[PDB]
Every structure is written in structure tokens, then in C-alpha cells.
Amino acid sequence: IFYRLNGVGITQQVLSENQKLIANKFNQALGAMQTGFTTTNEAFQKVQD
């Protein structure tokens, strides 16, 4: 993830300094989708029909 965010154009200073918040952001991003398992997920709509 460090090298991929290097690849998008983010400097190594903030990656060296801001690991915890981006880790929490990624973790809560992957945790929010479990409760989103409903009609709002267009992927479930496509699977369903």
C-alpha cells in the first residue's frame, strides 16, 4: 500500500508520518460495506436479477 500510494503521487513524508489514520480509514472503509448489503448495492441488484 505504501508503494501504491507512492505510485499515485503522494509524498513519502506524510506516508512516513500518517500511517495510523490511513490504516483506520482503510479498515473502516472495508468494515462499512458489510452493513451496506442491501438494495443500495447495485452489484446485489445485478446478481439478483
Distance CA(35)–CA(4), nearest Å, equals: 28
Calculated CA dihedral for residues 12, 18, 23, 25, nearest 10 degrees: -110
12 lines the binding site for other proteins (CB under 8 A): yes
Q: Which of 7, 16, 32, 39 binds other proteins (CB under 8 A)?
A: 16
C-alpha cell at 47: 446478481
18 lines the binding site for other proteins (CB under 8 A): no
Task: For the CB of residue 25, give the shortest distance to other proteins in the complex, in Å.
Answer: 21
- Footprint of other proteins (CB under 8 A): 2, 12, 16
